[PDB]
Amino acid sequence: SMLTIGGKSFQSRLLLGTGKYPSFDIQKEAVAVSESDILTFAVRRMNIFLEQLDLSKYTLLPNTAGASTAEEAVRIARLAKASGLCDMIKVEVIGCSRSLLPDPVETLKASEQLLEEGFIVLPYTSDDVVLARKLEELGVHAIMPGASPIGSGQGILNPLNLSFIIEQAKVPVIVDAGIGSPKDAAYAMELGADGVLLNTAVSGADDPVKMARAMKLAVEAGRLSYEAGRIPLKQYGTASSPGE
Amino acid sequence: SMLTIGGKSFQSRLLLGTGKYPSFDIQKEAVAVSESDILTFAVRRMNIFEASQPNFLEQLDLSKYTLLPNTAGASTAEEAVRIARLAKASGLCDMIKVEVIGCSRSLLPDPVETLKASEQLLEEGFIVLPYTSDDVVLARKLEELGVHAIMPGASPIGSGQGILNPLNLSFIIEQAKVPVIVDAGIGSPKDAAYAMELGADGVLLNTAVSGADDPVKMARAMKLAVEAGRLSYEAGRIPLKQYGTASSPGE
Amino acid sequence: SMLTIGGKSFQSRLLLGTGKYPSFDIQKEAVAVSESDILTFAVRRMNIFEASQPNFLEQLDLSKYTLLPNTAGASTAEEAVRIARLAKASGLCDMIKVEVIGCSRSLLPDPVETLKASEQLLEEGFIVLPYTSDDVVLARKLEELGVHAIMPGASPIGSGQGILNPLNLSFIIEQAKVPVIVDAGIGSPKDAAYAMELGADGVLLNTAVSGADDPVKMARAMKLAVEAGRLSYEAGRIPLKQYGTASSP
Amino acid sequence: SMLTIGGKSFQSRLLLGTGKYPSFDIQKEAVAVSESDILTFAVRRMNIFEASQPNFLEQLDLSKYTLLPNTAGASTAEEAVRIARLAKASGLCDMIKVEVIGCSRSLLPDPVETLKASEQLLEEGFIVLPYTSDDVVLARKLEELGVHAIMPGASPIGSGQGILNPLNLSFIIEQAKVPVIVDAGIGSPKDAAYAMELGADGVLLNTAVSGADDPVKMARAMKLAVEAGRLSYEAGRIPLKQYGTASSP
C-alpha cells in the first residue's frame, strides 16, 4: 500500500532533509530530482528561531534537532507549528553527544505530550525492538528507527532488529539516517520498510543532485524487490552456518 | 565513458541471463524492462546442442542485442572450447563467457582451466570474458592473457548472498585495465548497487531475476539498482564517521 | 584488573547460567571446569514457587559461588520485583539480575519495565544488574538510576548469533561507570572473546554451554575464550591496515 | 586428534612467525608462552641470505621446534625454490612454507607461481605447505599436486581484519584431504578461535602477536584462543536460531 501517514498518502517513499546543501540552487535541484513529497529540516537552525522552494508542493516534517529533553523538543515543535512550518513533527531528542543516538525516555515523553497536543507524531528512535512497540502504543503515526548513528554513513548495522520492528509494526516504519549510499536505502526497503529518510548522505556528497537521483532510484529498486519476492539464501551446510 | 568491451560500447551496464524464466512471454518482458544490451545464456542447454530441449532466446529480436553465450557445463578447458566453437558456428556468439566450474558443491570456478580456456579462445580470435573467483592476483593473470573483461563472482552461483569479499573485489577493480563485471551470487538490488558503488563497470545477473516470484518487476528493480549504484560511484559518497571505539582497531 | 561488582571482586570474568544442563552431574562438572564465580538461575522455574519445580542448584556447593538469581519469566516490573523478593527470602540472592522480556518472538527486553524494576529493587536494597538491549542511551539511563552493572545482550537470547552491533556495544562500554557484562546471544568462543576484546568486564552465558553436545568441554572453551579476549584487550592489538579502496569510504 | 603434517605430530595447533619482535628477549618469551611447536621465518630477509642481515633465530633453542622457513620476498617460483634450497643447505628446514606474493599493494599470493613452486619443491623432496588465497578450487588444485598442507589466508597479510570469507574457508576445510591451517590476516583471539571453530587444523600468525603492545601477553592470548576454538569445534556448538524475518531470505 502507498506510504500513508496520519491519513495522508505519499507517492514517494523517500523523505529528504534540507539545510546542509552547498547552495540553495543545488538544494532546489536535488529536491526536485529526488521527487520526494516530504521535506524534513532542523527547526532550530533557521531564521524564524530552505528558500527558493514552493512549500505548497510538499509536506513539511520539521524535526526537533538540538533538543536534550522532552521539554525542549515540545518548545521547538510548538514554535514550528506557530510559524506555519509543520504538517507533521519528527521527534528527535539526542542523548549522547558522541554517538548522537536518541534518548528513549525523553523520546517517549515528548511523543506522548505532542500527541496529546494534536500533532501528527513521528519519533526518531534506536533499533531497540520493544522500545519501538512502546512508541507505537503511545499512538505515534510512524516509527523511525535509525539504521546507524546520525552521519555515520555505515548503513543498517542490525538488520535483524530492524526486521523485528518492521514485522511487528502497525504504522509505517521509515529507516532514518545513518544511510551512506544507495545499497543501504535499497536494503531498508528490501527488509520491508515503508520509506527512508535521508539528509547528509545526499547533501554531503560531492554531487548532491546526482546522489539525490541515485537515492530516488535505490528506494524504488528496494521497494520493487520487496514486492517481487527475492530468491532465498542457498543452504550449503558448512561450519560457517551452524545448525544448517 | 559507457561500458566498452572489445571496442564496442553499451548503454546498459546490466548483463542479463536468459533461459530459466517461467515462460518466454515473461522472459521477453523481463529483457525489455531491464533495458539490458547484452544477453547471456548457457548454449550447451539449447536445441542447437540437442533437439530434446527447447531453445532459449525465443521471441527475442537477437539483432537488438549483443550475445554472450557461456560455457556452463564444461569441466575442462577443452570442453569449454568445444562449446564456444559450436556457439560461434551457430551464429549465437558475439563474445564468449568462459565458465569452467571446478566444484560440484560450491560451483566455484577452476582457475587453471579458466586460464587455459581463456588463452586458447583468445588465440582463436574470440572476444573473451572469463568468469572467475575474487582471487585478486588471478584476476590480473587473466587480464595479462589479453582478455576483454574480467568477471569475478560476488559469491557462489545461486547463493543469493551478494558480495562476500568487497575488499578483494575492490583490489580487482582498482588494478584492472579492462572492465570488471561482477557476475552472479547476486540476490537483490542492494548487492547490484554495491558492486557499482565499489567501481564495477557492470553486473551480470540471472537467477536473481528469473527466480523471483515476479521476474519482470525484479528485472526493473535490478536495472534501477545498477543505475543507482553507478550514479553513487560518480557522485562521491560520504565517508564513514570515525568514532575511535574498540570496534575499530586504530580508530 | 579484576571484576568488581557492588564492591565485591571475582577472579573469573565468566558468569554462568544453571538449570538447562542435561543432568546435574554434567552441570556440576561444567560449572567447575568453567572456573566461574557467579552463577545465575531463573527463580521463576525453580522449586521455590507453588508446584515443586526442580532445584536448578542441586549438587552444587554454594559456598563456592556468589548467587545471581534472575527474573526470567517476568513480563512486568511488578512480577520481576516479586521474583527477586522470593530469591532473597529463600536465602539465594547476593545480587539480582533484572530481566523483563517484552517480546515473545525475539525475547528482547522491555526498556520501560526494566527501568522501573531496577529502580524499585534498588530502593529495596538489592545489588542490581539489569539485562538490557544494545540501545546506547538506555544503558546510561539504567546506570544513572544507580545500578551496579549493566548487561547488554550481544543478540537476542538463544540466537547463537554473537555480537550483532559491536559499535553500539563499544559506546556502552566506553561511557560506562559500572562494569559492563555482555549477556546471552553468545554462540561460541569467538563471540565471548570479541566481547572482551571490546573492553567488556565480563560475559554471561547459558545455553551456548548447556546446549552444546559436550557441555563440559564447551565450558572449558568459554573459560579460555574469556581469558584470551581479556588478555588481548590488555595487550593492545594491531590496527586494521588501511588500503584506501572503495570498500572503505 | 592431533595436528599431523607429513606424518609428524604436533601438540600445539598454533604456528608462530619470528623475526619481527621488539627484541630477541621478547621473541623468546613470546615463543615460549605460546607453546607453539612450529616456527616460521623469512629466510630471504636474514643472515643466511645476506651477511648484512641479522639472524631472526638468535637466542632460540631450535632443537625444541620444527622449522618452517618461508619464501616471503620471492616474486617468482624460481626465487622461491632458491630460497627453499638455501634454507635446507643452512640446516634450517624441516618443512617449507611456499609464499609467492603477486601484489605489492595487497600482498596477496600469485596462484600460478605458487602452483609452480609447490610442484618443483615436491619434486626436490621437500615437505610442502603452500600459502594461498581463499579461492576454493585453487586450494584443491594445490592439494592434488601432492602438497602436505594448505594454508589459505584469512585476509591479506598484516591486514588484521581476520577471516573475510568464512564460507570459502568452510569449503576449503570440508573438501581437504590434508591439514588446513589458516595463515595470517589474523588480528585477535576472536579470529584465531573462529578459524578453529570452522574446523581448521591450525592457525599460523606473526604480526598480530609480534606487533602488539605486549607481544608476550598476546602470544598467551592466541595460545588460549586456538585451544578454545578447537574445543568448541569438538564440543558441538548450538545452532543459529531462525526467526524467519526478511533479514534471512
A241 interaction partners in chain B (CB closer than 8 Å)? none
Distance CA C22, CA C28 (A): 11
Instruction: Pick A238's closest partner by Cβ from D167, D238, D247.
Output: D167
Experimental method: X-ray
Q: Nearest CA to D191 among D172, D168, D208? A: D208
Report resolution in angstroms: 1.8
DSSP alpha helix (H) spans, A14-91: 24-34, 70-82
Query: Chain D residue with minimal CA distance to A167?
Result: D245
B114 HSE (CA, 13 A, CB side): 33
Contacts with B, C 116-175, CB within 8 Å = 166-167, 169-171, 173-174
CB contact under 8 A, C187 and D243: no
Q: In sequence order, what are the residues at sequence separation of 6 or more whose Cβ sits closer than 8 angstroms to the Cβ of residue C127?
A: C5, C6, C94, C95, C96, C148
CB contact under 8 A, C231 and D221: yes
Q: What are phi and psi of B14, to 5 degrees?
A: -100, 115
Q: Report how many Cβ contacts below 8 Å link chain B to chain C.
A: 54
Query: Chain A residue with minimal CA distance to D198?
Result: A239
Distance CA A38, CA A87 (A): 10
β-bridge pairing C8-10 and C3-5 = antiparallel
The answer to whether the CB of A208 falls within 8 A of the CB of A19 is: no
Q: Nearest CA to C228 among D30, B250, D227? A: D227
Query: Chain A residue with minimal CA distance to D242?
Result: A243
Quote the minimal CA–CA distance from C8 to chain D in Å: 26
Computed on alpha carbons and rounded to an integer, the radius of gyration of chain D in Å comes to: 18
Which domains are present in chain B?
Answer: 1-251 (3.20.20.70)
CB contact under 8 A, D231 and C218: yes
Distance CA C197, CA D190 (A): 8
CB contact under 8 A, D248 and A242: no
Q: Which residue bears the cell 584470551?
A: C228
Cell of B93: 556468439
Q: Nearest CA to D16 among D162, D208, D199, D179? A: D208
Active site residues of D: 97
β-bridge pairing C128-132 and C96-98 = parallel
Whether residue B106 lies within 8 A of chain D, CB to CB, comes out as: yes
A160, B100, C36, C165, C205 from C155: Cα distances, Å: 9, 41, 22, 8, 12
Whether residue A191 lies within 8 A of chain D, CB to CB, comes out as: yes
- Report angle CA A123, A128, A132 to the nearest 5 degrees: 40
Distance CA B224, CA D70 (A): 49
Q: In sequence order, what are the residues at sequence separation of 6 or more whose Cβ sits closer than 8 angstroms to the Cβ of residue C160?
A: A242, A243, C185, C186, C187, C188, C208, D237, D238, D239, D240, D241
User: How many Å from the N-terminal Cα to the C-terminal Cα in chain D?
Assistant: 37
At A15 the three-state DSSP class reads strand
Whether residue B248 lies within 8 A of chain C, CB to CB, comes out as: yes
CB contact under 8 A, A168 and C105: yes
Task: Count the Cβ atoms, other than its own, within 10 Å of residue C135.
Answer: 29
Q: Nearest CA to C41 among C107, C2, C90, C4? A: C90
Whether residue D11 lies within 8 A of chain A, CB to CB, comes out as: no
Mutate to test the interface with A, among B209, B213, B241, B242 (most CBs of A within 10 A): B241
The answer to whether the CB of C249 falls within 8 A of the CB of B238 is: yes
Distance CA B27, CA B38 (A): 14
Instruction: Pick B250's closest partner by Cβ from C167, C233, C239.
Output: C239
Q: In sequence order, what are the residues at sequence separation of 6 or more whose Cβ sits closer than 8 angstroms to the Cβ of residue B168?
A: B134, B135, B136, B152, D108, D164
Active site residues of A: 90
Q: Which residue bears the cell 579462445?
A: B121
Distance CA A51, CA B212 (A): 45
A143, B34, D20, D27 from D48: Cα distances, Å: 68, 62, 17, 19
Known binding-site positions of C: 158, 184-185, 206-207
CB contact under 8 A, B173 and C246: yes
3-state secondary structure chain C: CCEEECCEEECCCEEEECCCCCCHHHHHHHHHHHCCCEEEEEHHHCCCCCCCCCCCCCCCCHHHCEEEEECCCECCHHHHHHHHHHHHHCCCCCCEEECEECCCCCCCECHHHHHHHHHHHHHCCCCEEEEECCCHHHHHHHHCCCCCCEEECCCCCCCCCCCCCHHHHHHHHHHCCCCEEEECCCCCHHHHHHHHHCCCCEEEECHHHHCCCCHHHHHHHHHHHHHHHHHHHHHCCCCCCCCCCCCCC
Helix or strand (DSSP H, E) at D141: helix D136-143
β-bridge mates for residue B10, sequence order:
B3
Give Dmax (Cα) for chain C: 64
Instruction: Pick B170's closest partner by Cβ from C170, C242, C245.
Output: C245
Torsional sign, CA C139, C110, C164, C162: positive
The answer to whether the CB of B151 falls within 8 A of the CB of B181 is: yes
B199 interaction partners in chain C (CB closer than 8 Å)? 246
User: How many Å from the N-terminal Cα to the C-terminal Cα in chain B?
Assistant: 37
Q: Burial, D6: exposed, middle or buried (Cβ in 10 Å; 0-12, 13-18, 19+)? A: middle
DSSP alpha helix (H) spans, chain B: 24-34, 77-89, 111-123, 136-145, 166-175, 189-197, 207-210, 215-235
Quote the minimal CA–CA distance from A29 to chain C in Å: 25
Q: In sequence order, what are the residues at sequence separation of 6 or more whose Cβ sits closer than 8 angstroms to the Cβ of residue D14?
A: D34, D35, D36, D192, D202, D203, D204, D205, D222, D223, D226
Give the single-character DSSP code of B109.
B
D3 HSE (CA, 13 A, CB side): 23
Known binding-site positions of D: 158, 184-185, 206-207
Distance CA D148, CA D142 (A): 10
Write down the catalytic residue from B97, B141, B177, B223: B97
Whether residue A228 lies within 8 A of chain B, CB to CB, comes out as: yes
Whether residue B244 lies within 8 A of chain C, CB to CB, comes out as: no
Distance CA C192, CA C14 (A): 9
Query: Chain D residue with minimal CA distance to C107?
Result: D243
B123-141 residues labelled b (16+ CB within 10 A) or e (exposed): eeebbbbbbbbbbbbbbbb
Subunit partners of chain D (3 or more CB pairs within 8 A): A, B, C
Distance CA D200, CA D139 (A): 14
CB contact under 8 A, A225 and B191: no
- Report angle CA D31, D36, D40 to the nearest 5 degrees: 75
Q: Nearest CA to C146 among C169, C172, C171, C118? A: C118
Quote the minimal CA–CA distance from D203 to chain A in Å: 17
Give the single-character DSSP code of B101.
B
Whether residue C106 lies within 8 A of chain D, CB to CB, comes out as: yes
Give the single-character DSSP code of B4.
E
Q: Nearest CA to B31 among B44, B47, B43, B19? A: B19
Q: In sequence order, what are the residues at sequence separation of 6 or more whose Cβ sits closer than 8 angstroms to the Cβ of residue D102?
A: B137, B140, D75, D108, D109, D110, D111, D113
CB contact under 8 A, A190 and D240: no
Distance CA C199, CA C173 (A): 7
Cell of B61: 529480436
Task: Count the Cβ atoms, other than its own, within 10 Å of residue A9.
Answer: 10
Subunit partners of chain B (3 or more CB pairs within 8 A): A, C, D
Residue type, A137: E
Q: Nearest CA to A150 among A96, A106, A186, A114? A: A96
B133 interaction partners in chain D (CB closer than 8 Å)? 135-138
Known binding-site positions of D for 1-deoxy-D-xylulose 5-phosphate: 158, 184-185, 206-207
CB contact under 8 A, A241 and D240: yes
Q: In sequence order, what are the residues at sequence separation of 6 or more whose Cβ sits closer than 8 angstroms to the Cβ of residue D201?
A: D3, D13, D149, D179, D180, D181
Query: Chain A residue with minimal CA distance to C103?
Result: A130
Query: Chain D residue with minimal CA distance to C187?
Result: D238
CB contact under 8 A, D225 and C161: no
Quote the minimal CA–CA distance from C165 to chain A in Å: 6
Active site residues of C: 97
Cell of B28: 521477453
CB contact under 8 A, C245 and B197: no
Q: In sequence order, what are the residues at sequence separation of 6 or more whose Cβ sits closer than 8 angstroms to the Cβ of residue D193?
A: C188, C189, C190, C193, C225, C228, D225, D226, D228, D229, D232
Cell of D225: 584462543
User: Rounded to 10 degrees, what is the CA torsion of B218, B219, B225, B226?
Assistant: 150
β-bridge mates for residue D40, sequence order:
D17, D68
Query: Chain B residue with minimal CA distance to A222?
Result: B189
Task: Count the Cβ atoms, other than its own, within 10 Å of residue A2.
Answer: 9
D188 interaction partners in chain B (CB closer than 8 Å)? 249
DSSP A153-210: ----S-HHHHHHHHHH-SS-BEEES---SHHHHHHHHHTT-SEEEESHHHHTSSSHHH
Whether residue A25 lies within 8 A of chain D, CB to CB, comes out as: no
The answer to whether the CB of C74 falls within 8 A of the CB of C102 is: no
Instruction: Pick A232's closest partner by Cβ from D240, D245, D249.
Output: D249
The answer to whether the CB of D197 falls within 8 A of the CB of D232 is: yes
Q: What share of chain B is helix, strand, coil (3-state, %, to 5)?
A: 40, 15, 45
A7, A20, D44, D50 from D87: Cα distances, Å: 79, 62, 9, 12
